[PDB]
Ligand binder design. Structure first.
Ligand SMILES: [Ca+2]
Ligand SMILES: [Ca+2]
Ligand SMILES: [Ca+2]
Ligand SMILES: [Ca+2]
Ligand SMILES: [Ca+2]
Ligand SMILES: [Ca+2]
Lengths: 821, 821
């Protein structure tokens, strides 16, 4: 985490041994230490168990000659080292959330050598403990993304003095929100509770602390953090998480505490229900009195009368705080949120009391609305920013996957920090998963925005990947995380549909093929992993990539189906099938995530519907098959194709004729897939005469064109029946025709054998061209005919060329066309 | 194989039980049966072992009341059933290679019920036995492609009478050729022999017989089938394989028998060394006297004197055959090959004796050169066709993978059969692997070409896939086999290079992305397989697909590297890296095939070099890295980009400026990957004034253009500093400029909030356009400048539009450009 390259997998005299032949060195702690530090030290002890197979013993007396000595500045053992100048206590005293990690010789009598982890306060000590956890190899995501722990037999750590200094943002954390159906289902499946209890939140707290955050807004759609379980707040307070509430939840009451008793409580109008709402406020403050939770103040129900009533609500709330806490209101931390109604009041002069944090919000889509000017930056209480990775509302909700590329988060948050907003940073994380990477980035940036610039963003992603998957996997894993996040930034999954990208220009095909290419790369990486890494890889990379590449292909296929159905081309049916198959594959992938991956550990987390949005909300029953169209009796829907020119050319796959007239006995037969592109078409069988047979093609050409060059691509058939060679006649109906002999020189005569013969047969095709004058027509429509004059001619592709011809192995993209009857 | 849907996985009173609760029914055979039939029956007995865990007992007396009774028409038990009209003996007597498979009640006294497998001759009986093998689920490829056998506890087979009738081609088989280094290395690794001995060939024979072929040309570059091991011919003769030799190996002597003693033997000129060469011929015929091998006749060293000497050689060879065999020469089967020199002699009238098969050849690339006319079809000896899946020679060798799509094989071989060529079909198969599928198709077609037409080719591929991988895998496995074979038909791997496909038109990207998409589909299928199917899938599908998709991407990357290096664009370095990585991946894939897959069983088979061809032959040391180019000091090779218009537009990724002038303090900073396409560029940090800063772009426009529409795409930044909004100035240097305010209406005012505000911020970008008159310039070069007037403007993309603009999510493909200094 903080300090890279200081822990080694083998021992050394000038390094400090953390683990030797499977035996961990013991951890010394003051048995009366802050309990949250003790919990973290117990987690560290188990972290040594995950590494080596045996927990590091947690002792209360220096029984041993080598020790890991942990604690706060005021615990008995740490206090003794600072007093004896064995540790630079000045670097910690008065500092916020800071640790000092260093090896010292003879720290205590009877102890020869120790690693010291001293915190300026309880969170500083917890953070230093979790730094050691990451050194020995336990990712913050070891539980919440199943990131396995590499087993070890020996670990040593370099001497030196290490710290993360102080955090740059005072309160750094997350907001569980948009939490139904995913997080709520997962909690009910895991804990049996239709609410979040202290078991669930304890698990959330440990993750936030390991990530070095300190702050949480709890889930509140249909839950109440404070009311549902009395141990919720007690656990948060003990463990070291600062709790808060969102914008319109004043005075440490969760919204649902009012809603669940809306009939008993009244109006929520401060003018009529004033003493009912005052008592509401008071009870809340009483619940939190000796915790350090952040208190939202204010309220949302003429302009000057509104500004006055809000002024009264606030100073009323602050006398209630004074009353309950028994000390002046500024001794309790407070936050006041700017929303639309009160944004006007602010610009007219309205400010909270100056010790109060003023919380700003982004636009629900990751862009900051408003930042302090140089005159407003003065505000002694400072400023907050609320940022979205997930949103329910306009113009359409995004509830499914990560949509927040790393560049976007950084670009707006670096602006936020440079304008002086550094008291509170809190991110809407949805159900938490699958926002694991943007959460890590956002908290790391809140710790020290200074270490992030444009040139080094991806270094962060790389270190993240090396932590989750090992050095040897990190470059490629980070590349894929960065690139899929970028793709998801182009358009949310919920707003992606058949019309998002340009079909005719090739843009749709490009972005669909490129997402599938990303999937192929993720699959190759997946196959190189050890089995114990697969679930973490699926959660962090493979499922978002596979689900998005499948979703892109579904809508790309739908647009392809609609285009071909309009054109009356039976190929629409193939694309209808692909829409069905990909749509079902979406259900297969999320079934795997919920039920099979990690033995169903995350069942519930991936139940959000995403296919079938018609408005902004997800109030449709389930994932729904995108509408598709089918051509009845397709194998009889042939011929009748008419082409329009495009870019100085008409390019024609040979089976898309207008009409075909057969021979006596021999019939035009298309050979599916044959040749370089669509197919081949030939008179079958090769034993009958071809007299009178023909293929004809209908095409529109701009009347400005007076002569064309016709290219005809056929299979490199050799002259098996007659060494004169095969000929066919080619020309426009009512105009000039020429006869082409395409293989007279495909033989082993000395002048042919290597100059032409072996070159064209190894290529498998023959291209010939004639130049034909274009006679005048009233409508611009022409009929090109192909009359074979020998048996066995396999026609494949035609291009009539009047400027736009491009040399190419496939003979160019087919021009626009339609089918008739 | 022959009869589908007649074997069931559970028992039934009206079906015949082959396997019951793990116990197989016994196989009755005449203990004095033809030994090759006995070997096949022993293989059938072991096939029941692979299915159920216990071999079917092979007995010589009807000890049991239910039996599988097998044998030739003249074996004692079969002979008794035909005599008692229990079997329709008339349907078999006189017939060639035909079996009858049918359930009969009370076949023999003491036997209540039996499945009878009666052959018209030894191969007919062997074929009927192997039909039952496929019914119970043992693929012909169970050994040669590790196709696993589904375990069973119960099998029953429907009553009825089943046959494959008689084969349509008399001799059907393969030619091991181009066999070094792959097949030779695999044989040395597996058998320790620098030659093919009877252990190796016995394994080849069993495969050919299970595939229902009967013919082999043995490996002969540096081996001698007849001379290297005396059991080679004896095993072929016993087992039932007809042996032959290639065109210029007359009289059952392999070429190397002459070459290894070229100093002792002389000239190989029938005029000078006549009695030395006569004795050569005689010894050969003596070796084969009572086998049924096919004898090549003729010889290759004025025109009328040549036709006379060849006439003399032939009738000389035929008196030698008469002498050795003691019977007239026509009682020994003979074949005479047409090659170039003697093609003239044929058209002047020269024919072999009329009992001799006249062997024709394709062009070494799968196209038939010459077929009999209606007058020549008369030839009583009939005709052969030699067909290539592999070739060493012009214009360049193809030695690595399958290059023969199913459509091409069928289209030429159906022609071959319809013109009366049906005595000998033999395919050059290289090292045999990896031609497994075209071999199966080619032999199946030789058996009965009648059942193949254009509409049903892929049904064959589907049945093949269902046999190797199960019903549930068959559609998808066949789809991939068909599509990769088609791709390999476009250009051989050896002739593919950076120049094969069109780069500028998008064709190269298309075919590279589509091969990778095929790989992604193969990988998804691979993950659904049972572990015991993985090696067969890798051999038949995953390795050819992965190796080709990697090879395509390597050369596509090389062409991309060369284009960007020419343009002096540092992005060439990324593509240089991809060439290196893909080139090494080619070595990783074949290492896996040789050393890891199937525990190294096939080590040697995939050692052919394929990257580095400069001429027709593979006489370079090893796979060699394609040449790539790198730009030194790349992160300082920025700016200086000049664009040329294309298709009525100039499309510009914002970081490709010509020059950038910074502000006081704030500097132009590109944010890699940010936005929808290449990147974003912005003045950093957002706290300093932007006065005087600019980005300028140089572009050439046709002088016919008099006004343009300029689109500028920026990030949807909101007016955080000033609700007036952000502005930038945009215009041409020396011409008109306009000022754009791009976010004045991005707010929650009632007229903005849902009409524009939430729509554009959810899209993350803002596009604005101005219309600017185009002033005259002598050279057609223009400079467009972008001057930001507020902090925090994130520029992303520009398009100057004069006709060619297309609405698109990515704002079109960047126009041609170069970098300067
Ligand atoms: Ca969600
Ligand atoms: Ca501050
Ligand atoms: Ca679903
Ligand atoms: Ca080979
Ligand atoms: Ca015949
Ligand atoms: Ca190699």
């Amino acid at each position: 985490g903080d300090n890279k390259g200081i822990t080694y997998e083998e021992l050394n005299p000038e390094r400090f041994t953390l683990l030797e032949k499977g035996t961990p060195t013991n951890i010394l702690i003051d048995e009366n230490e802050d309990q949250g530090v003790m919990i973290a030290a117990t987690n560290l002890s188990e972290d040594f168990g995950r590494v080596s197979g045996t927990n590091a013993p947690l002792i209360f007396l220096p029984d041993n000659e080598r020790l890991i000595i942990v604690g706060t500045l005021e615990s008995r053992y740490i206090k003794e080292l600072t007093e004896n100048r064995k540790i630079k206590g000045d670097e910690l005293k008065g500092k916020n959330e800071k640790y000092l990690m260093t090896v010292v010789d003879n720290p205590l009598p009877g102890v020869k050598e120790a690693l010291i982890i001293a915190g300026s306060d309880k969170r500083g000590a917890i953070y230093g403990i979790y730094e050691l956890s990451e050194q020995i190899g336990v990712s913050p995501w070891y539980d919440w993304a199943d990131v396995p722990v590499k087993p070890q037999q020996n670990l040593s750590i370099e001497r030196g003095s290490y710290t993360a200094d102080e955090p740059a943002v005072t309160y750094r954390g997350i907001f569980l929100n948009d939490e139904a159906p995913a997080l709520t289902s997962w909690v009910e499946n895991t804990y049996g509770t239709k609410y979040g209890d202290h078991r669930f939140y304890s698990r959330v707290f440990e993750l936030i602390l390991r990530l070095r955050g300190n702050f949480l807004w709890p889930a509140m759609w249909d839950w109440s953090f404070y009311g549902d379980d009395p141990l919720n707040s007690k656990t948060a307070d003990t463990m070291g998480i600062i709790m808060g509430t969102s914008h319109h939840e004043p005075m440490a009451r969760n919204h649902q505490e009012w809603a669940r008793n809306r009939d008993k409580y009244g109006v929520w109008d401060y003018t009529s229900n004033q003493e009912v709402i005052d008592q509401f406020f008071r009870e809340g403050i009483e619940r939190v009195k000796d915790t350090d939770d952040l208190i939202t103040i204010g309220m949302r129900g003429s302009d000057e009368d509104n500004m006055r009533l809000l002024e009264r609500i606030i100073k009323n709330q602050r006398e209630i705080i004074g009353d309950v806490t028994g000390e002046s209101p500024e001794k309790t931390p407070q936050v006041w949120a700017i929303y639309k109604e009160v944004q006007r009041y602010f610009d007219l002069g309205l400010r909270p009391p100056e010790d109060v944090i003023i919380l700003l919000s982004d636009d629900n889509w990751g862009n900051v609305r408003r930042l302090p000017t140089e005159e407003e930056r003065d505000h002694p209480g400072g400023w907050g920013m609320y940022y979205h990775f997930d949103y329910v509302g306009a113009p359409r909700s995004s509830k499914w996957l990560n949509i927040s590329p790393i560049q976007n988060i950084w670009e707006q948050m670096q602006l936020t920090y440079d304008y002086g907003v550094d008291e509170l940073w809190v991110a809407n994380v949805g159900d938490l998963k699958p926002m694991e990477y943007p959460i890590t980035l956002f908290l790391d940036m809140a710790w020290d925005p200074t270490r992030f610039n444009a040139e080094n963003l991806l270094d962060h992603t790389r270190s993240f990947a090396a932590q989750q998957f090992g050095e040897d996997q990190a470059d490629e894993a980070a590349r894929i995380i960065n690139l899929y996040s970028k793709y998801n930034g182009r358009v949310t999954p919920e707003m992606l549909d058949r019309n998002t990208y340009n079909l005719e220009s090739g843009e749709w095909k490009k972005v669909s093929d490129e997402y599938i290419k990303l999937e192929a790369e993720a699959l190759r990486q997946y196959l190189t992993l050890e089995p114990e890494q697969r679930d973490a890889y699926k959660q962090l990379i493979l499922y978002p990539v596979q689900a998005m590449a499948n979703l892109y292909e579904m809508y790309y296929s739908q647009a392809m189906n609609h285009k071909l159905y309009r054109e009356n081309n039976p190929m629409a049916n193939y694309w209808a099938d692909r829409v069905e198959e990909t749509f079902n594959r979406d259900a297969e992938l999320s079934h795997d995530y919920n039920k099979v991956m990690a033995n169903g550990k995350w069942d519930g987390m991936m139940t959000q519907k995403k296919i079938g949005y018609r408005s902004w909300n997800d109030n449709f029953p389930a994932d729904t098959l995108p509408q598709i169209f089918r051509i009845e009796n397709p194998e009889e829907a042939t011929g009748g194709y008419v082409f329009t020119a495009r870019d100085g050319v008409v390019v024609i796959e040979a089976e898309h004729y207008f009409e075909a007239k057969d021979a006596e006995e021999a019939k035009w037969t298309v050979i599916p897939y044959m040749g370089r592109t669509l197919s081949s078409i030939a008179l079958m069988p090769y034993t009958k005469e071809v007299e009178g047979a023909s293929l004809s093609y209908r095409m529109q050409i701009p009347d400005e064109v007076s002569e064309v060059k016709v290219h005809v691509v056929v299979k490199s058939t050799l002259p098996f029946h007659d060494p004169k060679g095969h000929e066919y006649r080619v020309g426009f109906e009512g105009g000039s025709k020429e006869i082409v002999n395409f293989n007279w020189n495909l033989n082993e005569e000395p002048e042919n054998i290597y100059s032409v013969f072996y070159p064209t047969v190894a290529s498998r095709v023959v291209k010939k061209d004639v130049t034909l004058d274009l006679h005048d027509t009233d409508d611009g429509f022409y009929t090109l005919t192909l009359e074979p004059l020998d048996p066995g001619i396999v026609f494949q592709k035609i291009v009539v060329d009047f400027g736009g011809y491009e040399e190419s192995r496939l003979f160019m993209e087919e021009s626009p066309n339609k089918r008739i009857e």
